[PDB]
Write a protein that binds this ligand. Structure first.
Ligand SMILES: N[C@@H](CCC(=O)N[C@@H](CS)C(=O)NCC(=O)O)C(=O)O
Ligand SMILES: N[C@@H](CCC(=O)N[C@@H](CS)C(=O)NCC(=O)O)C(=O)O
Ligand SMILES: O=[N+]([O-])c1ccc(SCCCCCCO)c2nonc12
Ligand SMILES: O=[N+]([O-])c1ccc(SCCCCCCO)c2nonc12
Lengths: 208, 209
């Protein structure tokens, strides 16, 4: 069984939660309040002084993308071969890059930086549209014909950007259809509709 | 060679993967991209995320430095002995990437104003890797398990460039210090690090270090 240790926010656990839900995996949520975190003891015990912390039986992991890659590896969501595995990494690293830019905006420069960020957004999303266009016309997944951890990470990136800049996918038919298609997967649909997801803020500072 | 590295004339985000290839006795081609060629725009427009490095393994074209590291890691058997070790290797590399991003931000956006604060924060940033070494065979081997991983090469570069930025930063970290000496002494890697191919490239693209 799995345990997710995190703040009461979607943030960097959103993608891995979607993965677990869609894959019909059970997990426990250990919700850490800001007050508990500010006490200091849990933070000091964390490898890089940060969350998420993740438990897979006796194995304890840190780093959101390590968790995603671990679940991808152990559950067979990492491409069909080494070639696809490399492409999956390439997508995920791209998602991470834009997530970092997004987080920087949200937490450090929302008011002054939003206009420039949204203006630059089309150019940041186009690589993912291009990737879909080059994989079976964008009719399946981001890499190959089976779902990967990168799909869940990209899906979250796209969902949070729809909130930040409504209509940001309108120019991108493959990304638009991809979001709708993945979101309609029965277990994922149910999770995305649940208060467990809906009633958490996207970020920790009330900005989105 | 089956491998091609496409990059600016700098060490930067290719240093670790080059060390990996050299230490593993692999052949590769270097394709150098000048400031002018980059400013022209055509190569940049053709890159997936508009950035370098670009890497070729036969007809497989990759972008993203850590994607290249993981690809070489998997293919050359530098990704742990099993699934659990693979996760630990990823955990290390993600930590290295996190600090590398902070390093790059200092170098390229805020060197003069940010250096003092960065160097003050540095011991707290390096400590986790010392901790990991201490919990793995007393720090006498590698960062994860008893065989070298792509994370070792990435960590090694991170440590080398930080010793240039903050001389003596590893004085506080005996295991990290010995680790750098040990890995740097690996014969193929030692030869590569001493070679014009490595030495005559700057660490960064703006002449800061
Ligand atoms: N590279 C890390 C970063 C994790 C991170 O930024 N953690 C934040 C929340 S998403 C945190 O624990 N902030 C609290 C702190 O640093 O004190 C990952 O992917 O997990
Ligand atoms: N996430 C990327 C970052 C790549 C990157 O920041 N590339 C820089 C050189 S290291 C670049 O191409 N800058 C030129 C530009 O953006 O025009 C990776 O790991 O490869
Ligand atoms: O992915 N992030 O950069 C990130 C996620 C979540 C949060 S919310 C964490 C709330 C706990 C309070 C401590 C904030 O440093 C972040 N705060 O600064 N960067 C954050
Ligand atoms: O890893 N980096 O963030 C990074 C590496 C190398 C460089 S140097 C690239 C030189 C090309 C610049 C050409 C000027 O139009 C970085 N510049 O900004 N971030 C950089």
């Amino acid at each position: 069984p799995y345990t997710v240790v995190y703040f009461p926010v979607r943030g960097r656990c959103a993608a891995l939660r979607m993965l677990l839900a869609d894959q019909g995996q059970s997990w426990k949520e250990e919700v850490v309040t800001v007050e508990t975190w500010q006490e200091g003891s849990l933070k000091a015990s964390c490898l890089y002084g940060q969350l998420p912390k993740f438990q897979d039986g006796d194995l304890t992991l840190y780093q959101s993308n390590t968790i995603l890659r671990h679940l991808g590896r152990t559950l067979g969501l990492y491409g069909k071969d080494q070639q696809e595995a490399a492409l999956v990494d390439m997508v995920n690293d791209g998602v991470e890059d834009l997530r970092c830019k997004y987080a920087s905006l949200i937490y450090t420069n929302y008011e002054a930086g939003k206009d420039d960020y949204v203006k630059a957004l089309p150019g940041q999303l186009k690589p993912f549209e291009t990737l879909l266009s080059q994989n079976q016309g964008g009719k399946t997944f981001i890499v190959g014909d089976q779902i990967s951890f990168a799909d869940y990470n990209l899906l979250d990136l796209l969902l949070i950007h729809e909130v930040l800049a409504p209509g940001c996918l309108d120019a991108f038919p493959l990304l638009s259809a991809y979001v709708g298609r993945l979101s309609a997967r029965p277990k994922l649909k149910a999770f995305l509709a649940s208060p467990e997801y809906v009633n958490l803020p996207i970020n920790g500072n009330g900005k989105q």
